[PDB]
Amino acid sequence: AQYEDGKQYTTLEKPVAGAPQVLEFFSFFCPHCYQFEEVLHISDNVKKKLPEGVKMTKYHVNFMGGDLGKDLTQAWAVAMALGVEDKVTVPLFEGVQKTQTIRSASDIRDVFINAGIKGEEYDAAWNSFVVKSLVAQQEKAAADVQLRGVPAMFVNGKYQLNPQGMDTSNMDVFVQQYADTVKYLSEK
């Protein structure tokens, strides 16, 4: 077959009932995740290959970066609660990996302030139980699939994208192959 289990994708040994249709996991410490955001725009290109209105979910993970890695999962919960993901994704990636100006929770908060989120607004979200639940939700989704590597994408709780089986001599071909695979999996 053109698409084969073990090539462009793998099949979860224990499917995840009730999982989101397209689920991405990333870390702001993750070098390929930086590329998936700034150079490849994987999420945008996958969205354009799926039908209008399908839900795509993107969660942060704890297992990279120690203390700050957990602070970033909580900050990503704030970003989701406030709806400001598009305002903070690039500054957080660059603060961690390019300028290395993010060394503490205060530095993370600075990124949101500079992006125009009010201080009182950020701190109330940071300390809220709604954000505690969003942190728990991100942890539970990663736990459900025994996640040990990012960037990862899962389709309908059953299939995991295998980008190591995609050719990377041409970045646009790679993005297209990745998005076409998601579309194929979503239609199974």
Ligand X SMILES: COc1ccc(Nc2ccc3c(CC(=O)O)coc3c2)cc1
d(CA 79, CA 187): 30
Residue 97 sits in the site that holds ligand X (CB under 6 A): no
Quick one: tokens of 60?
């942060």
Using CB under 6 A as the binding rule, whether residue 165 contacts ligand X is answered as no
Render 168-181 in DSSP notation, one character per residue.
Answer: -SSHHHHHHHHHHH
Out of 164, 169, 172, 187, the residue judged to bind ligand X by CB under 6 A = 164
Using CB under 6 A as the binding rule, whether residue 136 contacts ligand X is answered as no
- Rounded least distance, CB 90 to ligand X, Å: 16
- Considering only residues 7, 16, 21, 32, which one is a binding residue for ligand X as defined by CB under 6 A? 32
Binding of ligand X by 35 (CB under 6 A)? yes
| Cα 135-136-141 angle, rounded to 5 deg | 105
Residue closer to ligand X (CB basis): 107 or 174: 174
**Looking at beta carbons only, is 26 or 126 nearer to ligand X?**
26
Q: Which of 97, 149, 176, 177 binds ligand X (CB under 6 A)?
A: 149
CB of 150 to ligand X, least distance (A): 7
Using the minimum distance from each CB to ligand X, give the nearer residue, 101 or 168: 168
* CA nearest neighbour of 174 among 163, 185, 183, 182: 163
Shortest approach of ligand X to residue 156 CB, angstroms? 19
Q: Tokens for 110, please give them.
A: 């600075």
Say whether residue 157 binds ligand X (CB under 6 A).
no
Number of C-beta neighbours around residue 13 at 10 A: 6
Minimum distance of ligand X from residue 29's CB (angstroms)? 13
**d(C-alpha 117, C-alpha 82), whole Å:** 9
Residues sharing a CB contact under 8 Å with residue 77, sequence separation 6 or more, in sequence order: 60, 131, 132, 134, 135, 138
Q: What residues make contact with ligand X under the rule CB under 6 A?
A: 32, 35, 39-40, 149, 151, 163-164, 168, 171
